[PDB]
Short mmCIF file of C-alpha atoms in Angstrom, two decimals:
data_model
loop_
_atom_site.label_atom_id
_atom_site.label_comp_id
_atom_site.label_asym_id
_atom_site.label_seq_id
_atom_site.Cartn_x
_atom_site.Cartn_y
_atom_site.Cartn_z
CA UNK Y 1 46.18 5.43 11.87
CA UNK Y 2 49.12 7.40 13.23
CA UNK Y 3 50.72 6.30 16.52
CA UNK Y 4 53.46 8.53 17.94
CA UNK Y 5 55.51 7.05 20.78
CA UNK Y 6 57.49 9.51 22.92
CA UNK Y 7 59.98 8.93 25.72
CA UNK Y 8 60.03 11.75 28.28
CA UNK Y 9 61.77 9.56 30.89
CA UNK Y 10 65.34 10.51 31.78
CA UNK Y 11 66.26 6.86 31.23
CA UNK Y 12 66.28 5.10 27.89
CA UNK Y 13 63.13 3.21 26.92
CA UNK Y 14 63.17 0.73 24.06
CA UNK Y 15 59.74 1.20 22.57
CA UNK Y 16 57.95 -1.87 21.22
CA UNK Y 17 54.88 -2.10 19.03
CA UNK Y 18 52.72 -4.89 17.63
CA UNK Y 19 52.53 -4.02 14.82
CA UNK Y 20 55.53 -1.75 14.26
CA UNK Y 21 58.61 -3.45 15.71
CA UNK Y 22 60.84 -1.57 18.12
CA UNK Y 23 63.24 1.32 18.59
CA UNK Y 24 65.60 2.74 21.20
CA UNK Y 25 64.27 6.02 22.52
CA UNK Y 26 66.66 8.06 24.57
CA UNK Y 27 65.14 10.90 26.60
CA UNK Y 28 63.21 13.23 24.27
CA UNK Y 29 63.15 10.83 21.30
CA UNK Y 30 60.00 9.86 19.42
CA UNK Y 31 58.93 7.20 16.94
CA UNK Y 32 55.94 7.57 14.63
CA UNK Y 33 54.29 4.60 12.97
CA UNK Y 34 51.33 4.07 10.66
CA UNK Y 35 49.11 1.20 11.89
CA UNK Y 36 46.61 -0.28 9.43
CA UNK Y 37 42.90 0.26 9.88
CA UNK Y 38 41.22 -2.81 11.36
CA UNK Y 39 44.23 -3.87 13.41
CA UNK Y 40 43.32 -5.99 16.45
CA UNK Y 41 45.58 -7.16 19.27
CA UNK Y 42 47.45 -3.89 19.02
CA UNK Y 43 49.99 -3.30 21.73
CA UNK Y 44 52.58 -0.62 22.44
CA UNK Y 45 54.90 -0.75 25.44
CA UNK Y 46 58.30 0.33 26.76
CA UNK Y 47 61.21 -1.92 27.67
CA UNK Y 48 63.83 -0.95 30.21
CA UNK Y 49 67.29 -2.19 31.09
CA UNK Y 50 68.09 -3.44 27.59
CA UNK Y 51 71.31 -4.40 25.90
CA UNK Y 52 71.41 -5.25 22.19
CA UNK Y 53 74.22 -6.31 19.86
CA UNK Y 54 74.75 -4.86 16.35
CA UNK Y 55 72.35 -7.42 14.82
CA UNK Y 56 69.40 -6.33 17.02
CA UNK Y 57 69.53 -9.26 19.45
CA UNK Y 58 69.87 -9.18 23.22
CA UNK Y 59 67.72 -8.82 26.29
CA UNK Y 60 65.68 -6.38 28.35
CA UNK Y 61 65.02 -6.44 32.08
CA UNK Y 62 61.35 -5.55 31.41
CA UNK Y 63 59.07 -6.13 28.43
CA UNK Y 64 61.56 -8.25 26.49
CA UNK Y 65 60.11 -9.62 23.25
CA UNK Y 66 61.94 -12.84 22.45
CA UNK Y 67 65.37 -11.20 22.66
CA UNK Y 68 65.08 -8.88 19.68
CA UNK Y 69 65.06 -5.12 19.21
CA UNK Y 70 62.41 -5.13 16.47
CA UNK Y 71 59.61 -6.99 18.25
CA UNK Y 72 57.47 -9.52 16.43
CA UNK Y 73 55.56 -10.59 19.58
CA UNK Y 74 54.32 -9.41 22.94
CA UNK Y 75 56.79 -8.84 25.73
CA UNK Y 76 57.69 -10.37 29.07
CA UNK Y 77 55.93 -8.91 32.13
CA UNK Y 78 56.17 -6.60 33.89
CA UNK Y 79 55.16 -4.10 31.20
CA UNK Y 80 52.66 -1.23 31.18
CA UNK Y 81 50.51 -1.72 28.06
CA UNK Y 82 48.79 0.52 25.57
CA UNK Y 83 46.27 -1.84 23.89
CA UNK Y 84 44.02 -1.14 20.92
CA UNK Y 85 41.62 -2.63 18.36
CA UNK Y 86 40.84 -0.26 15.48
CA UNK Y 87 37.67 0.23 13.45
CA UNK Y 88 35.66 -2.36 15.38
CA UNK Y 89 31.90 -2.76 15.41
CA UNK Y 90 30.38 0.39 13.79
CA UNK Y 91 33.80 1.82 12.87
CA UNK Y 92 34.89 2.57 16.42
CA UNK Y 93 38.34 2.24 17.99
CA UNK Y 94 38.61 0.51 21.38
CA UNK Y 95 41.66 1.17 23.51
CA UNK Y 96 43.00 0.94 27.03
CA UNK Y 97 45.96 0.95 29.34
CA UNK Y 98 46.41 -2.46 30.93
CA UNK Y 99 48.33 -3.50 34.05
CA UNK Y 100 47.18 -7.13 33.68
CA UNK Y 101 50.76 -7.91 32.62
CA UNK Y 102 52.24 -5.59 35.25
CA UNK Y 103 53.70 -2.08 35.35
CA UNK Y 104 57.17 -0.87 34.39
CA UNK Y 105 56.97 2.71 33.13
CA UNK Y 106 54.30 5.39 33.69
CA UNK Y 107 52.25 6.03 30.55
CA UNK Y 108 49.80 8.41 28.91
CA UNK Y 109 47.81 6.91 25.98
CA UNK Y 110 45.64 9.53 24.33
CA UNK Y 111 44.11 10.44 21.00
CA UNK Y 112 45.66 13.38 19.15
CA UNK Y 113 42.97 13.85 16.47
CA UNK Y 114 39.97 14.97 18.56
CA UNK Y 115 36.58 13.43 19.29
CA UNK Y 116 37.34 11.58 22.52
CA UNK Y 117 39.31 11.50 25.76
CA UNK Y 118 42.58 9.77 26.68
CA UNK Y 119 44.05 7.66 29.48
CA UNK Y 120 46.89 7.94 31.97
CA UNK Y 121 48.57 5.67 34.52
CA UNK Y 122 51.43 7.67 36.00
CA UNK Y 123 51.34 6.85 39.72
CA UNK Y 124 54.60 5.57 41.20
CA UNK Y 125 53.52 1.92 41.04
CA UNK Y 126 57.11 0.63 41.21
CA UNK Y 127 57.86 2.52 44.41
CA UNK Y 128 54.64 1.38 46.12
CA UNK Y 129 54.73 -2.15 44.68
CA UNK Y 130 53.86 -4.87 47.25
CA UNK Y 131 56.91 -7.02 48.06
CA UNK Y 132 55.30 -10.18 46.68
CA UNK Y 133 54.76 -8.46 43.31
CA UNK Y 134 58.12 -6.70 42.92
CA UNK Y 135 60.32 -7.59 39.94
CA UNK Y 136 63.51 -6.05 38.61
CA UNK Y 137 62.42 -2.75 36.95
CA UNK Y 138 58.70 -3.17 37.68
CA UNK Y 139 55.67 -4.47 39.50
CA UNK Y 140 54.01 -7.71 38.33
CA UNK Y 141 50.31 -8.38 38.29
CA UNK Y 142 49.39 -11.22 40.73
CA UNK Y 143 48.50 -13.43 37.71
CA UNK Y 144 52.17 -13.46 36.68
CA UNK Y 145 53.50 -14.09 40.19
CA UNK Y 146 51.04 -16.59 41.62
CA UNK Y 147 49.87 -18.20 38.36
CA UNK Y 148 46.40 -19.04 39.75
CA UNK Y 149 43.00 -18.73 38.16
CA UNK Y 150 41.56 -16.22 40.66
CA UNK Y 151 44.06 -13.75 39.11
CA UNK Y 152 44.63 -15.19 35.61
CA UNK Y 153 41.00 -15.88 34.77
CA UNK Y 154 41.40 -18.41 31.94
CA UNK Y 155 38.30 -20.11 33.40
CA UNK Y 156 36.20 -17.02 32.61
CA UNK Y 157 35.29 -16.56 36.28
CA UNK Y 158 37.11 -13.73 38.03
CA UNK Y 159 36.40 -10.60 40.06
CA UNK Y 160 38.55 -7.90 41.74
CA UNK Y 161 41.18 -9.06 44.26
CA UNK Y 162 43.16 -7.34 47.00
CA UNK Y 163 46.23 -7.36 44.73
CA UNK Y 164 44.30 -6.15 41.64
CA UNK Y 165 42.92 -3.33 43.79
CA UNK Y 166 46.47 -2.10 44.53
CA UNK Y 167 46.75 -1.32 40.82
CA UNK Y 168 43.20 0.02 40.51
CA UNK Y 169 43.48 2.43 43.45
CA UNK Y 170 46.58 3.99 41.89
CA UNK Y 171 45.44 3.88 38.25
CA UNK Y 172 41.63 3.85 38.15
CA UNK Y 173 41.41 4.15 34.37
CA UNK Y 174 43.64 1.09 33.65
CA UNK Y 175 42.74 -2.62 33.51
CA UNK Y 176 43.79 -4.13 36.84
CA UNK Y 177 42.59 -7.71 36.17
CA UNK Y 178 41.39 -9.59 33.04
CA UNK Y 179 37.67 -8.73 33.34
CA UNK Y 180 37.97 -5.22 34.78
CA UNK Y 181 34.85 -3.31 33.59
CA UNK Y 182 35.18 -0.12 35.64
CA UNK Y 183 36.45 2.81 33.53
CA UNK Y 184 38.77 0.48 31.64
CA UNK Y 185 37.63 0.48 28.01
CA UNK Y 186 37.76 3.71 26.04
CA UNK Y 187 36.52 4.48 22.54
CA UNK Y 188 37.32 6.91 19.79
CA UNK Y 189 36.00 7.36 16.23
CA UNK Y 190 37.42 4.75 13.87
CA UNK Y 191 40.65 6.03 12.29
CA UNK Y 192 41.72 8.13 15.26
CA UNK Y 193 45.44 8.93 15.70
CA UNK Y 194 47.12 8.41 19.08
CA UNK Y 195 50.18 9.28 21.14
CA UNK Y 196 51.81 7.12 23.80
CA UNK Y 197 54.09 9.04 26.20
CA UNK Y 198 56.45 7.35 28.66
CA UNK Y 199 56.88 9.41 31.88
CA UNK Y 200 54.16 11.96 31.01
#
């Protein structure tokens, strides 16, 4: 499956992908990767406020993945997430934008190959972020900030909260909390190709 990642932000975004690694994308730059059929736990995101040395090690203000440029793991919140599991069930892709690990950059996550609709979360979440949730370069989900089960849901019991609803009101088609089931999961034919755009 083809995933094209495009930075339209004026600021640099260090794209990250599991699988795929990572790449600096200055404004206008793109990165195209081929993700294997059947991939689960797929995640693409942007990192901001990064500095890296010549050996690909350093740190990002948002979305940092263990201090490396070429990510081999998920990143530090806050980070807007494109999530996907390919060729599941009867050969169907499942994908979403998630704000469960916060927001940093506005995002469009859409199929390019036809057969289904896409997803966008491009409200100014950072600007409107509640004070309790604000982080450098982003807006954390209440799970990250408060570290309680009503938000984090490891018990398996959770429902919408006031703080999850801040995210949901502004991005209705994104996951706002771990068990969000309102217009949060999207499907496409198995083997669909996708594009993730930062600052769409």
